[PDB]
Scaffold this active site. Sequence first.
Site, short mmCIF file in Angstrom:
data_model
loop_
_atom_site.label_atom_id
_atom_site.label_comp_id
_atom_site.label_asym_id
_atom_site.label_seq_id
_atom_site.Cartn_x
_atom_site.Cartn_y
_atom_site.Cartn_z
CE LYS A 1 -3.85 -2.02 0.15
NZ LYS A 1 -4.08 -2.99 0.11
CB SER B 1 -3.14 -11.38 2.27
OG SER B 1 -2.62 -10.55 1.95
#
Lengths: 303, 303
Positions: free
Chosen positions: B42, B263
């Site tokens: 991110k 994830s």
Amino acid sequence: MLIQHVQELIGHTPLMALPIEVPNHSHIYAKLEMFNPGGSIKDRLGAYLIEDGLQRGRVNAKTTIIEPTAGNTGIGLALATQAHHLRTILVVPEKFSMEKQVLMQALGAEIVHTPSEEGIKGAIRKAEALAATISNSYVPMQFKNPANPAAYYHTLAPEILADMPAPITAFVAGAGSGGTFAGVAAYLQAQDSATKAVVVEPEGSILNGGPAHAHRTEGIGVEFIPPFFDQVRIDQTLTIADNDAFAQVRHLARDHGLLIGSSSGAALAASLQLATNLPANSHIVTIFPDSSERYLSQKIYTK
Amino acid sequence: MLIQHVQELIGHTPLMALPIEVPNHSHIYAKLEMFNPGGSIKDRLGAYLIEDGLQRGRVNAKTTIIEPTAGNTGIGLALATQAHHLRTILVVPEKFSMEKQVLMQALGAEIVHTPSEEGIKGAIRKAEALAATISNSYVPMQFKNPANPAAYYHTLAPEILADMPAPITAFVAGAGSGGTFAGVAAYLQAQDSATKAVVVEPEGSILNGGPAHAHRTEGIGVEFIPPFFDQVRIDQTLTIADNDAFAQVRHLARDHGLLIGSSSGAALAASLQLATNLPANSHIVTIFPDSSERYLSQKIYTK
């Protein structure tokens, strides 16, 4: 950028010219050691301690590595032992660094707990006792092993000189085992005797004739004078309050996106202090051993 | 390796050829995005979202950036807003990601909480309402803003091709907002139409006609169909049980010292699954968005 093992990411860490206010228009550069795959400068120590053990014929394929640790060394060592498929037992005080313990175990190390009240001293004693009940074992013994300072002397130190844009006025680093400071300082001073070496200690260390008590800053602090200090001309020892260390932790994150551990804050606070007593336009190099993320469960950014 | 700002460390992450057993003698490469200064992929999105906002003339020096986030985007954005001296308000569900919220605040962002039961949908609604009460504001809106996939299309994607030692047989990535997958896939496929794009989702998502329930895999998962998929020829969608995702987290750490988030584990599990149905000696590329260190308070290595 294409690698095959996380080990390839150890070292060659960034040297950051801190874009902060520094006394007397000077400059503070910091080695960001939290970018090592293990999250700390100890990734360097573990690798070298095992290599040294193998080179000295003290370790073989079936040897059990046993080491007392209160934090990051456990992680760095576990990283290296797993690379060599070496069985690993880490002796750590019961409730010391929770997040680090989870990591130590996730990397395959088996942990043995010693009473919290006894600290590292107890862990050291149990590590030795366990070594006595396992014929084929080896205790790196980071607190007395010269391979400790040697690890940084041949890696971190040279990396600093290769990135520095000017001669180093002074080197500043906190001391736990004293390996980092002693290893880097020795190399720096060997290249330029003019370089001042300054050791940093947290609240309650006996390295500066201060009172012996528990401090908030995690990672540093010395019980007995590290044996590694022999190869260094220590120009000064600075004692930093937890208040200052954690303030630096908060400030660097808020203003520059640098997530540093409390010992990093202490090293920066010390570097800023030294700046006020060195000639203007000086170049000071320090080390940020690990991140703050490893202390979130300890409200490191609070109060 | 001298730098002046943490932002100089965003991107150019390593591509790791996983030294693990892969079906049909194939090979899986993973982009280790946890090595970004903010600890996740991110960092790339935050920077781009703010650059895009400035270019479109939607943001000025006094603008208040407001964004709904349930995780790493808040961190990546706060890093980018910090660099531009932009006031920042992040709207996040009450008890979503403890560790991430501390970092969000440490980086200077002001947090506003919305009920945990409302999820990201609740945070989105409040972000828009808050925006309505602040004249000079900007809502990047990561879930609908095409600048999201664009962030990876021009950075991460090309980085993969530059390190790949062979043509990419298949690209695999988990989809939360769908930005990472759509952005990278669109670029890879543009370069070579033969490249298969495969979306991954945790058990309990609509992306595969599955039911609707909470999953252990944090960071990923789709509520509604992401709009970004229109630029990709999705060749297959895979659903991964939490048990598989977390198994990979445990295995990669124990055997290779790779500290990955759930994830990431889901993405590796999907990639290994894809390998069993792709020609032998195939080359599969996937993304590991963040580390496991950020989930230690959630017993990520437990059970």
